[PDB]
């Protein structure tokens, strides 16, 4: 998270959209395509919590009591993470009676997402959990346990997936075209105003994450 903030400061300070010939294509690094992003989500936190589906079709829920339930894409294998960080590995078919409510909620959330929501990055060629999230008027901000930070913009449906380990960013535009860039290469070659503006917002969002952990 700290390194992500530094990577973004570096690219933003280079003023990528306002210093001559933009060579954005040359900043593309297809090697740095993320393995994991959030494809779907449901904000039901007024009662239960926030459910999400990862790109591999695995599902997760961050409940209001700060516990997490993670269903792997085989549809049975389960991970549970308590408040104190205690991780438990099991299956739905073998759950203790105590997790009954939470499993039911996950399966409900799973069904809605699978049946009624669009898969983000469905055209991208093919386990972390949700550490934290918040919502603004403009965007939902998703912080995964592998360090990745995703930002989905509500109004135009454009999305950023920020990968601190690769020092990279994947951008999904209004047409659902995806391009993955190395951040230092965006510094080297520049980019359009659209990407530049969302990266400035991204830095502000990472700063909010860092100030609220």
């Amino acid at each position: 998270l700290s390194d992500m903030l530094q990577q973004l400061h570096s690219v933003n300070a280079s003023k990528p959209s306002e210093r001559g010939l933009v060579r954005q294509e040359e900043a593309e690094d297809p090697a740095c395509i993320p393995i994991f992003w959030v494809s779907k989500w449901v904000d039901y936190s007024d009662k239960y919590g926030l459910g999400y589906q990862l790109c591999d079709n695995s599902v997760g829920v961050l409940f209001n009591d700060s516990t997490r339930l993670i269903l792997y894409n085989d549809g049975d294998s389960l991970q549970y993470i308590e408040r104190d960080g205690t991780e438990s590995y099991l299956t739905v078919s073998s759950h203790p009676n105590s997790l009954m409510k939470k499993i039911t909620l996950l399966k409900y959330f799973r069904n809605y997402m699978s049946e009624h929501l669009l898969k983000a990055g469905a055209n991208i060629t093919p386990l972390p959990y949700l550490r934290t999230w918040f919502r603004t008027r403009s965007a939902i901000i998703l912080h995964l346990s592998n360090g990745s930070v995703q930002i989905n913009f509500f109004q135009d449906h454009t999305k950023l997936i920020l990968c601190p380990l690769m020092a990279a960013v994947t951008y999904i535009d209004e047409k659902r075209d995806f391009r993955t860039y190395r951040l230092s290469l965006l510094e080297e070659y520049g980019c359009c105003k659209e990407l530049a503006s969302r990266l400035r917002y991204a830095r502000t969002m990472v700063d909010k994450l860092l100030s609220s952990r």
């Binding site: 779907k40 989500w41 449901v42 904000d43 039901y44 007024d46 809605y112 997402m113 009624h116 929501l117 669009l118 983000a120 919502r135 989905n152 449906h157």
Partner: peptide, 6 residues
């Protein structure tokens, strides 16, 4: 009450 793109 809110969700990702339908």
């Amino acid at each position: 009450p809110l969700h990702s793109t339908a």
